[PDB]
Design a protein around this ligand. Structure first.
Ligand SMILES: O=c1cc[nH]c(=O)[nH]1
Lengths: 250, 244
């Protein structure tokens, strides 16, 4: 049948029960082309949807847009169409000293600084990935030859104050988030991003398997600026890792 | 040059007012309603046009879905000198008396989002600037449409936070069980997904903002839709005129 936002049907998916879900529509086709017989399905707003084949099995690639709210729509609609496993892939900025540009982060849990996660489970509930998925992700990341870090990611509804940035129009951060950056750093949190709490919470409380893997393209604590080569490799590595992780899941 | 929108202060040609629809696909149509529309940039869900309205530079910029993507657009536009933000959209009503085709101008939003808490504590009201609300009401009335001023419920999800049960799991978390009836009985007009974030971040940061929406469906009960779509963008451009 046709879902309201993604504009595809269950038949369109060709029995796919796994989706790779990047944030940016413009990464979708690039991820699908690492696989076999990529076919464009639809593009509405931030949702660009392709199907492809991995080891003879149908797999969907669907962008989610920025933030938990746009993500919750994509996940819910893919679930209605029979998708049961969701592999988030991305790039990110680290906030710990020992984490280098080019390294991979597999999320073991997210700090829920979002709003959408609360629409699925109360705050007490752990925003945790599915164990098989994190396990498949770790393995695929290790095999890429990159250094892999397992740990907690802080997941914010904003890019600016929720990540305690002061280089902004007002130069001000609301009380709740003042000092929060140092707080996460001291608690061992690895990186910030903006969709994982919502994805992990909704899936963990709804019988869907999910997980997040991200290549580090910047370390926010270091002045040294990464060269373009290292960045291109990292983006390339990120998406090969998630496809290889998808392979392990099948 | 701002990080997500990819435009500079110079690109805006002095604009201090932006019209901010959700969908990138609507940005060009809105800009062409005015004079000398010019493409500025497109990156992810952010398509940015500039235009001129009664001799003044105006920006049109999509925000994508949800409070988080909106928060980025608004902040970067503000860094570029933008002080007034006119949100236009279409929406689904939850009051039986509100008709497909009517306009709703939000007078406050129930904060069922998350991003608003990144700007002000929950006690802070998600309320439009009074001049913008006034411009919006006047412009809506001039369109011949029936206009409702009222409270909007602004949710971070489309499904459980708007108490939809027609879903994969068929469950709605305890916080939102019975919430639709609750909002109805308190006279809330409609649901949408960005207004709480937009209104809180602007009201708490010295920016003027408001929301107007055409009603395209009713939760309680074509292409009348296309007529409403078109009317809604005519309404927001006229409201812009009144603000300038
Ligand atoms: O019910 C609706 C209809 C349109 N948009 C929403 O956010 N909710």
């Amino acid at each position: 049948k046709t879902v309201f936002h993604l504009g595809v049907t269950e038949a369109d998916l060709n029995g796919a029960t796994l989706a790779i879900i990047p944030g940016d529509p413009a990464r979708v086709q690039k991820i699908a082309e690492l696989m076999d017989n990529p076919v464009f399905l639809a593009s509405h707003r931030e949702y660009t949807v392709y199907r492809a084949e991995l080891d003879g099995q149908s797999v969907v690639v669907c962008s989610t847009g920025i933030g938990g709210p746009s993500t919750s729509i994509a996940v819910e609609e893919l679930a209605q169409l029979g998708v049961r496993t969701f592999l988030r892939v991305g790039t990110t900025g680290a906030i710990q000293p020992h984490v280098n540009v080019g390294d991979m982060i597999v999320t073991t849990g997210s700090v829920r600084l979002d709003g959408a996660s609360l629409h699925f489970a109360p705050m007490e509930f752990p925003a945790v990935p599915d164990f098989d998925v994190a396990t498949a992700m770790k393995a695929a990341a290790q095999e890429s030859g990159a250094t892999v870090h397992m740990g907690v990611t802080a997941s914010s509804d904003t890019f600016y104050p929720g990540q305690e940035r002061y280089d902004t129009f007002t130069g001000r951060v609301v009380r709740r988030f003042q000092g929060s950056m140092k707080e996460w750093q001291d608690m061992g949190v690895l990186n910030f991003e903006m969709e994982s709490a919502t994805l992990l919470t909704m899936c963990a409380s709804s019988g869907l398997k999910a997980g997040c893997v991200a290549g580090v393209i910047i370390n926010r604590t270091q002045k040294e600026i990464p060269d373009h080569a290292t960045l291109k490799e990292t983006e390339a590595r990120s998406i090969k890792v998630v496809v290889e992780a998808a392979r392990k899941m099948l």
